[PDB]
Symmetry: C2
Subunit: 434 residues, 2 copies
């Protein structure tokens, strides 16, 4: 029946003994042969960890699971490679080696390289369709989930085509993206285009911008929240209301707004400081008390989106972003949040059997794991890990290629060296979109 | 089985689809890359400090952002491995390894403390993959552009409590338990001569001028000892080229520099705000490179030619050394390694029973940063093949990093593994006990 998920690649024994630190128990050729299918993907779930390069994965694993531990979500995908995410200089069209989130999200959502800060447009400011828009056009259900504000670059890139990622609402758009402003003849702000795109399920932060009023069109003078209500959206704002939702579709599309800005971070800790690993004690991260059972977690939004979207017989596309808001504990807790959502995605995909799950990052954070005695010129912090040993992290974004991993039909297309724009084409082809 | 022939960007990177590295679905290609048949031979290539960041920076500089390393980027099966060491007293993980503990991990399958070679945290010796290959009748090679006493080549042939124990004098001082005159197996260089790989090629002639303190060759230089023990000594490209065989009667020992072999490229050191305060750098060829000193790729090709005569098979390790905060030196070292990987893949594709593995011991701390960056450490702007500026910042590390493979049993590098799994992968692929 099922393509396998890696069940346990923790160190298998005593890490001080011969063979004790192995993560494999035997040859993987048969398992990998059994991981390969080019049958259609009925569904795709793409999980994005903001800033989640290989270093961030390693630091979080070290801290939360121990050096020899295992992320049951992030580390469990059997097919892995590395992809490149360079942007373009807008004026020259030459590579810009260090992307922002907007140019990278544009690359995987549209298959076109662009300039830093662009959403859903190329270097000539020309719109190109997104994977979510194409999935909808093919009759698939669509979901867009983030613990960031929903106007932020990663969720916005699926639904908005604007010349600057700053163009959150009518007022920023009229100022910074005048050609996109609704009353200046464009398609509108990020939030307005989101409302037009009408995904079946959209869940995240960013309530604040919905208080703005539209400047033109049918809903001029209404807030964007009022516009959503008038256009048939089901609006929820907490865990209980999200739980009360029984269906989400084009008649009653779901819009969950769970915070005015970003949703709460999982863990708190002090900021990193100059010579912090030397001058301050080792840190143990703590729970954020703003986290509570009235605010759904990334994993809970993921699971609810899967339930709702999986009702569509033709299939669904779902993107889930674990947002990042030099705070090591914040960053590590965000990786933990993403791992839980990946587990939900893989649990569903393993059972359903026709679901491609992809886990990657937009670009990497600058954090590095360094020797405990390090005297570094940037910001550092010592942390007390799950092993009862000190790990030091140093902040001294970046251009390094980074991990992409997948499970399910067409997952072979993430192995080896690829570009971030290949991810668009992988998703397009896997779902049979044109 | 297919090598990745071209994963450069396929067109105009400003146009839809023009930056794609794929031309179509890869399921069939990847399935065809998977074999569970025996490996006759293994070639393990190690780039010192070559994490994903260094691969990217060198690609961006030498090939352009959308370019492709025909060796490093062409291996079809890829994963990431963990390389943490251990605290010697507590046995808890130490999150940032040195080159010795990492080399010990893949060559013996045992984690150890930073600085250890071929011993565990209890200072107990464990056999290496090269020693096991030789015991099984396979030919063995050990190639490096570093000094041959350095951690990576040393780990295959020496068991010492500190990587500093290069020769008799340092060993007597720093590894007294290993010192020959104290009943130990000897210095790194003495254990190298005992191990008697069929092919050993690299730098580090300096330590061979020391004399042994005890044993059969007491008072002779270690070079004299090698000569006395039947080694073919060579010291330049012509002498290397004239070698027609290497085996246990006539093992080959090439010593091509006093210390490390010459770096490929020169450039200035990175400096505070160097990307702002100094012009963009174009790397230059090192005048000390010349056709009398074999390159990493040439040593790799000659080793393959000599070792491939063994009908049972061979094990070969090739290390591209990294000699502070010098972007051009570092990038040129990755280019050197890519050339050697090309030679290994060319051989492996023709021979068909060869597992080629490319990875690093641990990653350098360098990062690729925005052009306008004002960073607290050292920075440099570089003029790349794209005719654009790339900035590197220096401000070793613990990140997991790429491992890639081609040939029988290459599946065992995909996904998350540990650096110690690499030992077991090589053992099992060659059918060693």
């Amino acid at each position: 029946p099922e393509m396998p998920v890696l069940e346990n690649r923790a160190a298998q024994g005593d890490i001080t003994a011969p063979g004790g630190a192995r993560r494999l128990t035997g040859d993987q050729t048969a398992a990998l042969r059994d991981s390969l299918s080019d049958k259609p993907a009925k569904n795709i779930i793409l999980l994005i960890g903001d800033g989640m390069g290989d270093s961030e994965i390693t630091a979080a694993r070290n801290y939360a699971e121990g050096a020899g531990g295992f992320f049951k979500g992030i580390d469990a995908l059997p097919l892995t490679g590395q992809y490149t995410h360079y942007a373009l200089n807008k004026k020259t069209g030459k590579p810009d080696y260090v992307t922002d989130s907007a140019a990278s999200a544009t690359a995987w959502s549209t298959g076109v390289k662009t300039y830093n800060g662009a959403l859903g447009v190329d270097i000539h400011e020309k719109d190109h369709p997104t994977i979510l828009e194409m999935a909808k056009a093919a009759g698939l259900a669509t979901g867009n989930v983030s613990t960031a504000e929903l106007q932020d670059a990663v969720p916005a890139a699926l639904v908005a085509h604007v010349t600057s990622r700053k163009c959150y609402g009518p007022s920023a758009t009229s100022e910074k993206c005048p050609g996109n402003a609704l009353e200046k003849g464009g398609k509108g702000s990020i939030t307005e285009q989101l409302l037009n795109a009408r995904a079946d399920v959209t869940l995240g932060g960013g309530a604040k911008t919905f208080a703005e009023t539209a400047t033109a069109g049918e809903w001029q003078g209404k807030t964007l929240r009022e516009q959503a209500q008038a256009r048939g959206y089901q609006l929820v704002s907490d865990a209980a209301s999200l739980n009360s939702v029984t269906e989400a579709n084009q008649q009653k599309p779901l819009l969950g707004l769970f915070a005015d800005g970003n949703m709460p971070v999982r863990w708190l800790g002090p900021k990193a400081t100059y010579h912090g690993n030397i001058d301050k004690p080792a840190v143990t991260c703590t729970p954020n008390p703003q986290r509570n059972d009235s605010v759904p977690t990334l994993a809970q939004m993921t699971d609810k989106a899967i339930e709702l979207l999986s009702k569509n017989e033709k299939g669904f596309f779902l993107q889930v972003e674990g947002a990042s808001i030099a705070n090591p504990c914040g960053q590590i807790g965000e990786t933990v949040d993403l791992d839980e959502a990946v587990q939900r995605a893989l649990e569903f995909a393993k059972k359903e059997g026709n679901t491609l799950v992809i886990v990657t990052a937009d670009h990497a954070h600058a954090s590095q794991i360094v020797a405990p005695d390090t005297k570094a010129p940037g910001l550092t912090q010592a942390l007390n890990t799950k092993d009862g040993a000190v790990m030091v992290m140093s902040y001294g974004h970046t251009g390094s290629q980074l991990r992409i991993a997948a499970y399910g039909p067409h997952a072979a297309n993430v192995v080896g060296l690829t570009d971030q724009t290949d991810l668009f084409y992988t998703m397009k082809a896997a779902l049979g979109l044109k």
